Amino acid sequence: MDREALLQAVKEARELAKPRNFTQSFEFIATLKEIDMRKPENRIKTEVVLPHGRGKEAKIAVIGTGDLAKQAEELGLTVIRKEEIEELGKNKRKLRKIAKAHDFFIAQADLMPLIGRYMGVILGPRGKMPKPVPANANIKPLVERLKKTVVINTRDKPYFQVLVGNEKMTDEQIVDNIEAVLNVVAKKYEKGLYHIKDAYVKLTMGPAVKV
Ligand SMILES: [Cl-]
Ligand SMILES: [Cl-]
Ligand SMILES: [Cl-]
Secondary structure (H helix, E strand, O other): OOOOHHHHHHHHHHOOOOOOOOOOEEEEEEEOOOOOOOOOHOOOOOOOEEOOOOOOOOEEEEOHHHHHHHHHHOOOOEEEEEHHHHHHOOHHHHHHHHHHHHEEEEHHHHHHHHHHHOOOHHHHHHHOOOOOOOOOOOOHHHHHHHHHOEEEOOOOOEEEEEEEEOOOHHHHHHHHHHHHHHHHHHOOOHHHHEEEEEEEEOOOOOOEEEO
């Protein structure tokens, strides 16, 4: 599965897709062979920074006080202050809304207990448990990475699908992004990309094109 094959798949996925009145995203899909997904160690749940980003930036919320909140404000992010944590635990409807509206959460490390007690019941099952940072952290670099980040998640099945860009990006960009995703698999298993059984590219409402 070389770059030429990937470009061909992206190109055809783009061409086959019917026009729709929204900007469609590119999705990359892979099945795995000869990997025992019954062993938890073989499962993948890994963030990947896409070199050209997602198409539209991921939305990030920050749970923090003091200078963490200041930084979040300076970066234009949703801020959830310490007082709001208990409130959101009460108002789970609102918490669901906030969870849906964001792709990643960053949290002041010392707030993790409070977050687990009150918000984790909603965030955890959605895979949006916050990632902790030290209270003195400069979060700008992390935020910039997360804006371009997608998650590869197989759960317990030899399959994943992941966002790799949108149609306003170039084919070359989509392929770079797909390569970044594949590198996770390459690094994960002893024989790496040997374990790719079949791979596909599609636009949101277009057909899946096999690589
Ligand atoms: Cl990465
Ligand atoms: Cl969600
Ligand atoms: Cl291109």
